[PDB]
Design an enzyme around this catalytic site. Sequence first.
Site, PDB file in Angstrom:
ATOM      1  N   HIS A 167      22.237 -25.257 -87.094  1.00  0.00           N
ATOM      2  CA  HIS A 167      20.846 -26.247 -88.080  1.00  0.00           C
ATOM      3  C   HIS A 167      20.987 -25.861 -89.317  1.00  0.00           C
ATOM      4  O   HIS A 167      19.942 -27.004 -89.847  1.00  0.00           O
ATOM      5  CB  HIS A 167      19.544 -25.828 -87.273  1.00  0.00           C
ATOM      6  N   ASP A 207      23.992 -22.598 -81.486  1.00  0.00           N
ATOM      7  CA  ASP A 207      24.206 -23.211 -82.858  1.00  0.00           C
ATOM      8  C   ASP A 207      25.193 -22.349 -84.026  1.00  0.00           C
ATOM      9  O   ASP A 207      25.239 -21.290 -84.397  1.00  0.00           O
ATOM     10  CB  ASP A 207      23.081 -22.185 -83.776  1.00  0.00           C
ATOM     11  N   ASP A 215      15.099  -7.288 -91.178  1.00  0.00           N
ATOM     12  CA  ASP A 215      15.449  -8.321 -90.164  1.00  0.00           C
ATOM     13  C   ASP A 215      16.246  -9.422 -90.944  1.00  0.00           C
ATOM     14  O   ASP A 215      16.335  -9.240 -92.189  1.00  0.00           O
ATOM     15  CB  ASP A 215      14.045  -8.553 -89.521  1.00  0.00           C
ATOM     16  N   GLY A 223      16.738 -19.084 -94.905  1.00  0.00           N
ATOM     17  CA  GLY A 223      17.304 -18.432 -95.948  1.00  0.00           C
ATOM     18  C   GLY A 223      18.995 -18.784 -95.976  1.00  0.00           C
ATOM     19  O   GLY A 223      19.502 -17.981 -96.416  1.00  0.00           O
ATOM     20  N   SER A 262      20.130 -17.781 -92.613  1.00  0.00           N
ATOM     21  CA  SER A 262      20.905 -19.187 -91.664  1.00  0.00           C
ATOM     22  C   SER A 262      22.551 -19.279 -91.666  1.00  0.00           C
ATOM     23  O   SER A 262      22.763 -19.881 -93.204  1.00  0.00           O
ATOM     24  CB  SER A 262      20.341 -20.241 -91.568  1.00  0.00           C
ATOM     25  N   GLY A 263      23.180 -19.006 -90.952  1.00  0.00           N
ATOM     26  CA  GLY A 263      24.060 -19.844 -91.068  1.00  0.00           C
ATOM     27  C   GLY A 263      25.323 -18.095 -91.620  1.00  0.00           C
ATOM     28  O   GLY A 263      26.542 -18.258 -92.048  1.00  0.00           O
TER      29      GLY A 263
END
Lengths: 61, 254
Positions: free
Chosen positions: B41, B90, B186, B190, B192-193
């Site tokens: 994504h 993803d 958590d 930013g 992500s990945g």
Amino acid sequence: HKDDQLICVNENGGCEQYCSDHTGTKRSCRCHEGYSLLADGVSCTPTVEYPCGKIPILEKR
Amino acid sequence: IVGGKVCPKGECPWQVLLLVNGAQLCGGTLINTIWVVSAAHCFDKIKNWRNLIAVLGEHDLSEHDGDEQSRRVAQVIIPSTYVPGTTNHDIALLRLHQPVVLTDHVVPLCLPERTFSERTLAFVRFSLVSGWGQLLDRGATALELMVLNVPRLMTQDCLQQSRKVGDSPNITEYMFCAGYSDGSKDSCKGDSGGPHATHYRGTWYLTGIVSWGQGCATVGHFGVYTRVSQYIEWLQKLMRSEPRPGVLLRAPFP
Ligand SMILES: [Ca+2]
């Protein structure tokens, strides 16, 4: 003590890294690229300066 | 990252920073000198792929200390099963235009074999997640790389411990939950990945990819990560293939 164990599913077969089951009561441990398997048949030791999954600043304390 | 701490410079050497036109886009994980694993994504709204840059050895975004290594992204490979705008599958595999040089500050995370990851790593309680994402929901992003230790949960336990939303995406076999539901710790936008790294007998392995979650540190919710074990063979096959014209490449999955 360190060796033994056949089923890779149980305690990773005693392997430090990768484990493969063979026909019968057999088991073979393997190591990621950049590592070599020791004579105990389960331990992996770095063969390069920067092996994956190791933190240099910490390995050198 | 919310509720975490600063990753001491060099203690997160596989962490990758992805930039688009110089702006922070996402995180990633170096797995060898030329390959980076990230989240599909992250490239949903990319216009010109020639503007994608991967940075290794990064720590403090406000300065340059010389340990940083920047590389252009020559290929972004996404599973044919991924659908832009959704959450399932993803994952993305990025090929750098030139390999990075391994150093004390730049080291790859080990991509484990499927079996080992499914029957050993998947059972390790805690794992580390990191990134320069938002420090708080609806908040500013971090200037220094942050890290957080999060516990992994069974998909069944997750669903039974999370507040129903209905419109919220489902947790498939290609994902897993990790974190807390008390709204304290958590991963966040930013991040992500980024990597979800698991330690086993003195070595760290890639087990997940920061994917999604209800807001950030939302009470009654857990962070959702891509279950990397399902893509080991897919990734290995691609890393043995020759590059092809055009940055974006959709590859069949399985
Ligand atoms: Ca810097």
